[PDB]
Amino acid sequence: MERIKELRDLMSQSRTREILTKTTVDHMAIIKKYTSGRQEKNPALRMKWMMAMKYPITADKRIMEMIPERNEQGQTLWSKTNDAGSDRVMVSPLAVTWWNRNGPTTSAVHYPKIYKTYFEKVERLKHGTFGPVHFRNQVKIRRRVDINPGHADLSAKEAQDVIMEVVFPNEVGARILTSESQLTITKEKKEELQDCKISPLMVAYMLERELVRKTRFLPVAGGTSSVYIEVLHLTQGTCWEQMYTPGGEVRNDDVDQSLIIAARNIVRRATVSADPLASLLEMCHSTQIGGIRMVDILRQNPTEEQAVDICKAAMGLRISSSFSFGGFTFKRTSGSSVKREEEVLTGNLQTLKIRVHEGYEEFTMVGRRATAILRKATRRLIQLIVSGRDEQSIAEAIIVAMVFSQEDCMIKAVRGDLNFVNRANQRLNPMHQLLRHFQKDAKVLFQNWGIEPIDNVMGMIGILPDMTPSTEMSMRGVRVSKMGVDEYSSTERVVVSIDRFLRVRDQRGNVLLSPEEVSETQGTEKLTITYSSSMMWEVNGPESVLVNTYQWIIRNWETVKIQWSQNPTMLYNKMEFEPFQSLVPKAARGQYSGFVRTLFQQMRDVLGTFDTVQIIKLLPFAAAPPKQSRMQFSSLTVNVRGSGMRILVRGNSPVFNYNKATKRLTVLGKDAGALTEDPDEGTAGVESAVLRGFLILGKEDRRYGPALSINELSNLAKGEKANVLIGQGDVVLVMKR
Amino acid sequence: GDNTKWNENQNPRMFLAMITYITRNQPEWFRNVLSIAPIMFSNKMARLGKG
Amino acid sequence: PVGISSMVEAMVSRARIDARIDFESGRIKKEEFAEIMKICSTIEELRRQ
Amino acid sequence: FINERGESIIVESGDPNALLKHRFEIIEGRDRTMAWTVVNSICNTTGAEKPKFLPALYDYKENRFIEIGVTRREVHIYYLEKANKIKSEKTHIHIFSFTGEEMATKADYTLDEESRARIKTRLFTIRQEMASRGLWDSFRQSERGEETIEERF
RNA sequence: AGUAGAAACAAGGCC
RNA sequence: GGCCUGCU
C-alpha cells in the first residue's frame, strides 16, 4: 500500500515527475548506473590512502539513529556530512566494529542454508582423510574440468530461468519450462522454500551459484572429479603428490568410474607382467581407491566391464559371463555351435588355420558407445542390426560383426603385414589381429562383402560404405537402426580358468577373456588412484620395519592379549620391538615409555575400558627403558625420512588408521591385518588411555567452563572435572583420579 | 618474433575489405551494420589532449 | 527490466493488478481496494497533465 | 462490470460505482512485459494453464482467456490456425471479419449481442471509409506479410 | 634547492 | 581570514 503513497509523493515534484514520465522501463539500467564517480584504476592505492582519513566508509542514513555519535571514549562513529551523490552518510570503521560488539543481535540459523555450497565444502574438508606424500614427477597436462562440486546439469540461461521461476513466479515472463527434470528440481526447491524469511534476491543468487555449472582450464594430473578439483592445490605439486579422500557423497558413479579405470590400468600392466596372475593378485591386494580398498568395492559393487570382470575373477570371487568380442559384449540367445579346426587362404595369399563354428545363432552385442543384434549361420552372416551413436561407432560395430561372421568375403580382404605376435614374442589371437587391422579403415571389406535386394519394409534407411545411403540396394544382410539399449542386461556370472598369459576360459572349453580385449582408451580417473606398487618399503621400508611390526603384533594378538595382562614386562622387553626403537629419537624414548606404561596400567585398573587399537598402537613405544616425567603428549614422533611422522594417541592419522567398517588396519597406506572383535570391548564412551592421570567421561558440556588445553592441566586436583580441547579440534570432558 | 608498430599500420580500409569478404551472401542490413564501423574509423579525428 | 512503457505507467499497472488479485483472493478488502484505485486514478491524472 | 455474484450491469456510458468489479481485464495493448506479468499473476492466483501465446482479454467469472482477431483472408482458415496455435485450448476464441462473418469455439459467445452489433457497425463503417479511400484491396492483399518483420537498417 | 624525465610537482578553484 | 577538494 505504501508503495503508491511514496510514488505519489515522489511524482508531486516537477523534476521527479519529469524523470518518472520521460524515462521508459528499458532505460532503467542506464539510469541506475548513471554516476559521475568513475571506477578506480588502482584500487589498492586508493584503499591504502583512504583508511588514513576519518570516515572512509559510507553507510545508510539509519546509522544516524542506530549507532551513537561517539563511543565510550568519544571517537566519532559517523558524521552528518553526506556522500557525494547519495543520501548515505559517512562513517568510520569504528562504526563497523561498534556494530559487531554492540549492534542488534539476530538468529542466524538460516545462514548455513543460504550459503549451503560453502558449508558443504567445509563439511567435505572436515571429514577428509589424508595419506603419505610422494615425491615424483607430475605430468601436469592442461584440460577443461568442472569446478562446481554439485552442478545441477543446467546451462546458464536455463539456470537463470529456473531461478526466476522459483524465486520470482510472476516475473518469469513468456518462458515455460520444458524438461521434466527441470520441473522435478523446481518442485523440490519450491517445497523446501514454502516459507523462507530471507530476501528473494539472496535466494536467487544462492540457487544460481549452486545450480549453474562452472568450467575452468586447469593443469590437472589425476582426478578431474569436481570433488577432487576443489582441493587441486593440496594434492598436486611440481614434484610432490598426496593421496586425498574427500569426506563427501561417495557417489556410486564416481566410485565405479574410478574402479573401471583402475581395472583397465591394472590389466594393461599385467598383460606385460611375467606372471600376470600372481602380480595381479598381489597388486589388487596392494592398492586402494578413494580410501577404500579395491577388494571391498569389487566384492560390493557389481559393474560390467572387461577389466573389472577380469579383476573380479582373478580374486576367485563370483565372475560374470556373456562373452565379449573386440571390446564389445556379446550374449548368445539361440542355437548351438561346434568348432571345426579348418584351413584356408587370404587375399594376400597367406595361409592360416582357424576354428569356424557350426549352427545358426543369434547374439546381443553390447559396448561402450554402441550396440547391435546379429543372426548368423556356419561361416555365413544372416542379418545384422546396429544401434551406434556416431557414424564411426556404427562402422566399428559393423566391422566387428563382419569379422565375427568369419565370411570368406572378409578373409579375401586381408592385405598387408599383419603378424600375429605380441611385443613379448607371444603369438597373438588371430581374431583380434584382424579386428585391429580392419579398424584403420575397412574399405576393402565393404567393396568385397556383396550386394542383395531389399523389400523397402518399415522405411528403413540404407547402408553406407562411405556415407552413401542406398534405399533400394544395400549390403547383404546388413541393416540400419538406432536402438536405445540392448535387448536386456545378462543374468549369470560364470566360473573360469586362466592361463599364465591371462587367457580366461569357461567350463566347456571356449575362450572368455584375454589381454587383447582390454579396450585400450586412456581415461582419467575421478577419484585418486592409490596405485600402491613402486610406492613401497624398499627392501625394508617403514612399510617394512614399521608397517610390518604392527602386522606381527596383529598376527600374534591371541597371546599378546593375555601376556599384556599377566607378566607384561616380558612383553615390552621383547626382541621384536627393537628395530622400531631405533627410529624413536634417543631423547624421548623413556618419556614415551613411562607415559604409555602408566596409560596401560590405569587402563588395567579401572574396569570397562579396553581398546585394542590403543594397545596395538602404543606398544612399540613402551619397549624402551622407562624414564619418568610429568608432562603429556598429543602425538608420538617416529623418524621416517629425516622427518618426524606423528602418531596421534587419540584417534586415527594418515600413518595409523583403523577403519570401523571393514575392520582393516592401515599403516602408511599398506594393509597390516584384519582386526577382530573382542566381546569385552568397553563400548561406554570412556577412554582411560589418552591422558596420563585423567579419564575421558564423554563429550563436552558448557557447565564446567571454557576449553582448557593439554599443557595447563596440572592446576586441577582431586575429582575436578573439566573440559579439554584435544585431537583434531574436538572438545571433551575429563576427570582426575 | 614480434611485430613493430602494429597499430600504426592496420589501415581501417583493410578491415572494411575483410568485413565485406566475411559478409558475402548475407542480408544487406547485416552487411551495412557491420561495415559502418571501419567507415567511421577511416575518418576519425584524434583529439590532441590536455595541451 | 525490459519493456518500453514509461516508468509511471508500469508502476500504476502493477499496483492495479496487485490490488485486483489481492482483493479477488487475499487480504485486501473493499475499502483498501477503493483507496488504492482512487490513488492510482489521481496518479494517472497527474501524469496526463 | 461484474458484481457480488455472476452477473453484469453492462451500462452504456458514465455509470460507475463503488463496487467496480470490472468484468474484463484487458491484456492486449499493455506491452509484452506487463502483459506477461499480469498473465502469470492471474494464472498463478487461479492456477490455470498459461497460454503459450499472448491472449487478448480475460474472463473473471468463468476464469478463462479470450482471443479476438481481425482478418482479411478467409475466416475459417484464420480460425483454425488460431485454434491449432492454442494448444490444449481452454480459452475461448472469437473472430470478427469486416464483411460481418463471425465464428468461435463451441459458439459460446459470452457477450451481449448489442455489443456484437456495435462492433459490426464499427467494422462496417471502417470498411465504408476504406472503400471510399481505396486502400481496402491493398489491405486485403497485404495481410500475408504483416506477421513477418524484416530489419531495414 | 629537491623529486623527476621527453613533462610535470614543488598546492589549486571561488568569493 | 572563512568555505570547498586530495584520481574530476
Side-chain angles (χ1 to χ4, degrees):
Chain A
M1 290 294 98
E2 61 274 12
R3 311 180 304 183
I4 304 82
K5 293 178 172 295
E6 299 205 354
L7 174 60
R8 170 183 62 201
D9 302 6
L10 190 65
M11 281 198 69
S12 60
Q13 309 313 74
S14 71
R15 210 292 189 261
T16 51
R17 158 167 59 263
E18 190 268 13
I19 177 54
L20 258 295
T21 309
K22 271 63 169 186
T23 194
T24 70
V25 163
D26 273 315
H27 297 1
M28 216 58 52
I30 302 162
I31 296 300
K32 171 72 74 172
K33 260 171 292 307
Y34 187 107
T35 195
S36 192
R38 47 183 167 185
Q39 293 74 38
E40 304 85 340
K41 304 186 185 63
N42 201 339
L45 198 176
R46 220 64 55 197
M47 186 63 187
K48 286 179 161 295
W49 169 264
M50 200 77 74
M51 293 297 297
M53 301 158 56
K54 319 308 190 308
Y55 319 137
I57 299 169
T58 60
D60 190 358
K61 300 181 296 190
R62 299 177 293 178
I63 279 285
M64 302 280 252
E65 74 89 4
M66 225 178 299
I67 283 171
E69 261 292 62
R70 351 180 85 87
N71 62 326
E72 177 272 0
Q73 271 186 219
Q75 302 173 125
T76 59
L77 309 189
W78 52 262
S79 66
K80 80 183 195 299
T81 289
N82 218 323
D83 198 358
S86 296
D87 56 352
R88 304 171 64 84
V89 300
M90 309 252 275
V91 316
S92 49
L94 286 98
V96 185
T97 174
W98 192 103
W99 180 277
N100 288 98
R101 79 182 184 85
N102 277 331
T105 176
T106 297
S107 69
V109 71
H110 76 302
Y111 219 69
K113 302 299 195 68
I114 171 60
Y115 294 103
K116 101 191 298 301
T117 64
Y118 310 158
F119 283 72
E120 194 171 1
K121 217 177 289 184
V122 166
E123 167 62 7
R124 278 197 297 274
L125 187 77
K126 178 171 175 289
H127 294 196
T129 74
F130 298 95
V133 63
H134 289 153
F135 281 48
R136 174 168 36 75
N137 287 319
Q138 302 307 85
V139 284
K140 306 272 274 181
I141 66 177
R142 300 173 194 274
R143 50 171 156 183
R144 159 161 284 95
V145 287
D146 310 67
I147 313 308
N148 181 278
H151 72 265
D153 178 61
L154 311 170
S155 68
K157 312 311 302 183
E158 193 192 45
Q160 182 177 51
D161 290 354
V162 171
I163 305 336
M164 277 197 61
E165 174 164 355
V166 163
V167 186
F168 307 111
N170 314 327
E171 289 64 2
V172 62
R175 284 296 315 113
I176 176 58
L177 303 176
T178 178
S179 175
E180 64 82 13
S181 59
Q182 298 173 37
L183 315 191
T184 53
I185 61 181
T186 311
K187 277 296 304 309
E188 161 52 35
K189 298 148 188 170
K190 189 143 60 177
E191 295 300 337
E192 57 76 25
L193 60 87
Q194 75 301 353
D195 50 2
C196 194
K197 325 305 163 298
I198 189 57
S199 173
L201 208 179
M202 281 297 166
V203 179
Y205 212 77
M206 115 181 171
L207 290 171
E208 185 160 328
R209 85 167 62 96
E210 71 138 314
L211 287 166
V212 176
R213 84 192 310 275
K214 284 154 47 51
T215 58
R216 280 159 42 86
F217 230 130
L218 295 175
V220 54
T224 56
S225 181
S226 63
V227 303
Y228 279 95
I229 293 287
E230 152 180 329
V231 304
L232 185 57
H233 68 325
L234 179 144
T235 67
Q236 216 68 14
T238 64
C239 59
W240 54 271
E241 143 181 348
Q242 177 180 40
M243 304 178 181
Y244 183 73
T245 59
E249 203 353 295
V250 288
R251 288 188 175 183
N252 56 7
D253 297 330
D254 314 347
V255 177
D256 63 48
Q257 196 283 339
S258 298
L259 189 88
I260 278 157
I261 181 170
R264 292 173 194 182
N265 214 1
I266 181 73
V267 169
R268 218 164 307 285
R269 203 197 318 88
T271 54
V272 60
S273 298
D275 185 8
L277 191 58
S279 307
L280 170 64
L281 287 169
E282 301 300 343
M283 296 172 86
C284 294
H285 278 88
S286 314
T287 189
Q288 62 288 52
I289 308 85
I292 300 181
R293 312 199 296 100
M294 184 76 170
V295 309
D296 304 1
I297 302 302
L298 205 62
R299 283 107 45 91
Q300 181 277 346
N301 187 320
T303 312
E304 314 298 347
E305 195 280 347
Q306 303 96 13
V308 169
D309 294 44
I310 286 165
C311 329
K312 286 162 172 286
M315 323 336 294
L317 277 281
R318 293 182 183 174
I319 313 94
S320 338
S321 72
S322 175
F323 180 75
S324 173
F325 191 108
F328 292 165
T329 317
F330 285 59
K331 167 152 184 152
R332 188 174 75 195
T333 77
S334 295
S336 297
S337 169
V338 174
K339 288 161 272 178
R340 214 158 63 178
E341 319 191 345
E342 64 87 8
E343 181 78 332
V344 174
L345 276 291
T346 50
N348 63 347
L349 281 298
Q350 313 298 299
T351 307
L352 72 164
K353 194 193 283 157
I354 61 173
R355 320 187 290 262
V356 308
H357 292 85
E358 293 177 350
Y360 158 80
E361 284 187 321
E362 316 195 344
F363 301 88
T364 314
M365 278 56 71
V366 192
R368 293 182 183 174
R369 314 191 301 189
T371 299
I373 287 148
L374 198 151
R375 308 160 36 202
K376 68 170 267 288
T378 299
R379 193 181 286 277
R380 180 222 175 89
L381 190 147
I382 294 169
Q383 187 168 119
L384 168 62
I385 310 92
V386 187
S387 170
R389 298 185 171 180
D390 194 279
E391 313 309 334
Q392 56 166 18
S393 300
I394 294 169
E396 288 170 355
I398 282 158
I399 60 185
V400 170
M402 291 298 101
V403 178
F404 193 88
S405 67
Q406 298 179 304
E407 262 193 9
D408 291 332
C409 299
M410 170 270 300
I411 276 160
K412 303 284 177 68
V414 181
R415 309 204 204 292
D417 170 63
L418 190 71
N419 51 308
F420 312 83
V421 187
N422 200 66
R423 269 179 213 74
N425 212 1
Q426 296 170 358
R427 284 77 51 214
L428 280 165
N429 204 15
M431 212 46 48
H432 288 235
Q433 286 297 92
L434 300 145
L435 195 147
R436 197 205 195 177
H437 179 73
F438 301 126
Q439 266 174 2
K440 308 190 291 190
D441 202 347
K443 60 191 179 71
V444 181
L445 183 60
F446 296 151
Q447 293 85 18
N448 296 14
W449 187 253
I451 303 290
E452 273 187 321
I454 66 175
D455 294 331
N456 302 117
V457 165
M458 176 183 67
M460 55 72 63
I461 304 94
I463 293 169
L464 60 91
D466 283 278
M467 183 179 289
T468 176
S470 300
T471 73
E472 200 272 300
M473 184 180 72
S474 170
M475 289 335 287
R476 58 175 287 259
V478 188
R479 303 286 99 77
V480 177
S481 184
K482 190 172 73 70
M483 296 297 102
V485 68
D486 84 347
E487 285 174 36
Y488 168 74
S489 160
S490 110
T491 49
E492 54 291 285
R493 295 96 273 142
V494 294
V495 167
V496 292
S497 65
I498 304 166
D499 196 357
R500 287 196 299 111
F501 294 99
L502 303 151
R503 294 82 62 86
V504 181
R505 314 200 41 71
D506 186 68
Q507 309 304 74
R508 287 149 174 72
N510 69 319
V511 171
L512 189 155
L513 276 164
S514 84
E516 315 309 324
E517 289 191 29
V518 240
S519 161
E520 266 268 60
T521 281
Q522 296 178 357
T524 304
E525 78 303 333
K526 291 299 299 304
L527 294 84
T528 192
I529 280 196
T530 323
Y531 169 31
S532 163
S533 271
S534 64
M535 289 50 70
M536 71 151 288
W537 355 337
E538 182 17 69
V539 152
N540 214 102
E543 292 91 349
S544 205
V545 159
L546 299 177
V547 145
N548 297 183
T549 290
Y550 287 117
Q551 183 176 359
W552 182 93
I553 181 166
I554 283 283
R555 288 193 277 88
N556 286 248
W557 180 242
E558 284 80 46
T559 185
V560 173
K561 184 259 280 163
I562 198 72
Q563 187 160 36
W564 176 87
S565 314
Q566 297 172 324
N567 185 228
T569 65
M570 215 74 192
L571 168 56
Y572 305 141
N573 297 316
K574 184 64 70 68
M575 196 162 179
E576 318 281 353
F577 303 138
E578 286 171 12
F580 184 94
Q581 278 277 312
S582 83
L583 313 171
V584 181
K586 296 203 164 180
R589 280 178 189 168
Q591 282 78 35
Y592 290 7
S593 300
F595 182 60
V596 171
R597 291 194 189 194
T598 315
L599 264 63
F600 289 166
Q601 182 51 81
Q602 83 202 3
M603 175 174 201
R604 290 182 216 111
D605 289 8
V606 311
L607 272 289
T609 56
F610 190 82
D611 199 359
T612 59
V613 175
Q614 290 280 286
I615 310 182
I616 288 162
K617 197 201 280 155
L618 301 169
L619 258 164
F621 296 91
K627 283 203 227 178
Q628 310 307 304
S629 170
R630 274 74 171 175
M631 76 189 148
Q632 298 207 26
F633 302 95
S634 59
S635 282
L636 307 161
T637 192
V638 73
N639 197 76
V640 230
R641 312 326 207 190
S643 313
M645 294 203 110
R646 279 197 328 281
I647 283 152
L648 275 147
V649 172
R650 204 185 183 279
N652 292 0
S653 313
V655 176
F656 188 105
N657 53 290
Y658 167 52
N659 200 333
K660 206 180 149 198
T662 184
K663 290 97 191 173
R664 312 297 286 198
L665 184 67
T666 312
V667 173
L668 194 65
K670 285 299 301 198
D671 202 333
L675 192 144
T676 58
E677 191 275 322
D678 192 306
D680 283 317
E681 272 274 309
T683 47
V686 179
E687 302 172 321
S688 63
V690 173
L691 267 47
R692 192 183 265 269
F694 298 110
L695 285 62
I696 284 159
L697 312 179
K699 292 194 288 289
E700 56 175 329
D701 55 3
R702 264 154 282 286
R703 291 182 259 165
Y704 302 94
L708 281 76
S709 179
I710 283 157
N711 316 121
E712 51 165 28
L713 292 164
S714 66
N715 293 319
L716 315 193
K718 179 68 174 66
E720 265 189 310
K721 291 194 190 196
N723 289 315
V724 191
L725 79 166
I726 61 189
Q728 308 303 268
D730 293 354
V731 192
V732 310
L733 182 72
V734 305
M735 177 60 146
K736 204 160 202 178
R737 313 187 68 250
Chain B
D2 188 1
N3 307 98
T4 190
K5 305 296 178 294
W6 180 260
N7 291 322
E8 283 66 319
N9 296 326
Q10 299 309 132
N11 213 279
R13 303 160 202 272
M14 290 299 89
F15 293 155
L16 175 52
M18 295 178 200
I19 293 284
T20 298
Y21 189 86
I22 290 165
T23 63
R24 283 187 301 102
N25 309 330
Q26 299 299 298
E28 196 186 27
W29 74 269
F30 182 57
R31 187 174 237 173
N32 291 332
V33 68
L34 250 53
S35 305
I36 282 284
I39 286 163
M40 282 188 69
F41 259 127
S42 304
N43 310 318
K44 67 196 179 296
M45 341 286 286
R47 201 164 185 274
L48 289 181
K50 284 172 52 50
Chain C
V2 310
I4 62 101
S5 310
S6 52
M7 182 151 59
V8 188
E9 187 157 353
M11 288 171 166
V12 169
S13 299
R14 191 75 199 278
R16 277 203 267 264
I17 286 296
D18 184 314
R20 180 63 174 200
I21 62 176
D22 299 3
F23 185 78
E24 200 76 354
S25 300
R27 304 79 48 186
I28 296 296
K29 54 155 180 165
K30 62 190 189 305
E31 280 74 13
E32 307 305 335
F33 197 2
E35 292 175 9
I36 199 71
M37 291 289 285
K38 62 188 299 184
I39 296 164
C40 298
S41 63
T42 179
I43 286 174
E44 181 174 44
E45 169 55 25
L46 174 56
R47 149 188 167 196
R48 195 59 44 83
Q49 182 279 341
Chain D
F1 308 85
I2 212 72
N3 62 338
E4 305 297 351
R5 280 167 280 95
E7 59 283 345
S8 189
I9 314 306
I10 180 157
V11 311
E12 79 297 337
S13 177
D15 286 353
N17 56 12
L19 282 58
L20 291 74
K21 302 192 177 193
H22 297 242
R23 209 292 213 174
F24 279 69
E25 171 59 66
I26 303 182
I27 295 290
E28 194 72 5
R30 302 183 72 94
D31 195 330
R32 291 182 302 90
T33 74
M34 209 56 48
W36 274 118
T37 289
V38 61
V39 166
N40 273 317
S41 296
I42 61 186
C43 180
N44 160 35
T45 303
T46 65
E49 280 59 19
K50 97 185 295 184
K52 301 180 69 59
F53 280 60
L54 284 163
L57 300 75
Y58 184 65
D59 182 328
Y60 279 136
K61 61 182 294 301
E62 208 278 350
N63 307 85
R64 72 178 176 175
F65 293 101
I66 310 182
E67 182 64 10
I68 294 90
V70 195
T71 301
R72 284 77 67 178
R73 294 277 73 90
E74 211 291 324
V75 295
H76 207 338
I77 56 180
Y78 190 93
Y79 167 82
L80 55 88
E81 292 175 27
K82 274 276 154 289
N84 92 324
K85 179 53 55 55
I86 305 173
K87 316 312 301 302
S88 71
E89 62 284 5
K90 297 299 193 306
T91 73
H92 200 255
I93 305 92
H94 209 153
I95 180 63
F96 298 103
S97 53
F98 306 91
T99 185
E101 211 287 344
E102 298 176 350
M103 263 189 303
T105 183
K106 196 179 149 193
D108 293 11
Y109 319 97
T110 57
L111 205 67
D112 197 12
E113 298 300 340
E114 291 76 335
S115 310
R116 316 284 292 290
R118 158 168 54 266
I119 295 177
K120 293 250 285 183
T121 55
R122 190 73 174 90
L123 294 166
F124 208 64
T125 297
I126 284 292
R127 261 289 294 272
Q128 267 87 71
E129 306 322 319
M130 193 76 69
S132 297
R133 167 48 40 195
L135 269 293
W136 172 225
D137 164 69
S138 59
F139 273 55
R140 274 192 286 89
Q141 70 181 9
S142 61
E143 175 166 331
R144 55 188 61 267
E146 286 170 5
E147 64 93 354
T148 185
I149 308 91
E150 292 74 6
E151 190 66 25
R152 286 213 70 262
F153 185 102

